Design a binder for this molecule. Structure first.
Ligand SMILES: *C(=O)N1C[C@H](NOS(=O)(=O)O)CC[C@H]1C(N)=O
Length: 251
């Protein structure tokens, strides 16, 4: 049941698209089909998968797990501490997740992405987009070789959270816990992660909010994506749009 829908009023003039999928009744709701099928860098939404990779390989073990902060100075106050998994996920702490993933061999990551059908599964540029000058604050998931479409994001979220992967249930529940967000509506449970990048080649943002919604027995897996040319459009802004869509059409 694939419905093409018009969520444009919630996008308040920003270029983008949305896809919501309920796998129980296979009701696919799509705004801007062309964009929803286009692969792009996942940016910080990759933290959903890298958290699971780290748990499966034992690099981390719980919401409390630390990565051994070494005292390096960062402009974000909250990166300058021995933060837990839960805090690094919510702060999108790049050094924590870079150190995590660099403890994992490339073959293991390749095979996990292949199993998840995670877009092009292209980790060939492991170091990331070094031409931006940011050095070790870079990786294959940040405007680099790995690309995934919004529709594929939803398919991956569904496989993970419906229990259809080999990841341990314990590890899925840790991810659920740390992705939960507060939308000031107790009648829906929303979970997700933002991502922000700028596509230098095409001069457009990659601004993401990916996650799931639970509303009384029904679950929707969703991905909201902007490709606007305005650099002010970030992941957090697209999360605002996503929340407005959820409150208008999914309450
Ligand atoms: C992930 O996309 N990133 C890490 C960090 N958080 O992004 S978020 O607020 O959209 O979740 C900063 C932006 C980006 C990056 N430049 O690495």
């Amino acid at each position: 049941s694939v419905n093409i829908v018009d969520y444009s009023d919630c996008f308040e003039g920003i270029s983008g698209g949305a896809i919501f999928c309920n796998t129980k009744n296979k009701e696919y709701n799509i705004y801007n089909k062309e964009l929803i099928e286009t692969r792009r860098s996942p940016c910080s939404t990759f933290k959903i998968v890298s958290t699971l990779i780290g748990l499966e390989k034992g690099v981390i073990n719980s919401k409390e797990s630390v990565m051994g902060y070494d005292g390096t100075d960062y402009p974000n106050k909250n990166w300058n501490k021995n933060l837990s998994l839960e805090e690094a996920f919510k702060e999108s702490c790049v050094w924590y997740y870079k150190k995590l993933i660099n403890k994992v061999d490339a073959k293991s990551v390749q095979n996990i992405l292949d199993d998840l059908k995670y877009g092009n599964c292209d980790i060939s540029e492991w170091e990331g987009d070094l031409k931006n000058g940011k050095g070790h604050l870079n990786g294959f998931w940040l405007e680099s070789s790995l690309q995934i479409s919004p529709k594929e994001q939803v398919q991956t979220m569904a496989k993970i959270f419906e229990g259809d992967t080999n990841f341990k249930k314990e590890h899925i529940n840790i991810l659920r816990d740390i992705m939960a967000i507060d939308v000031n509506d107790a009648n829906i449970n929303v979970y997700g992660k933002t991502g922000t990048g700028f596509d230098e080649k095409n001069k457009r943002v990659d601004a993401w909010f990916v996650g799931m919604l639970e509303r009384e027995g029904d679950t929707y897996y969703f991905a909201i994506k902007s490709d606007d040319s305005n650099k002010e459009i970030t992941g957090p802004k697209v999360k605002e749009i996503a929340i407005n869509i959820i409150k208008k059409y999914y309450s």
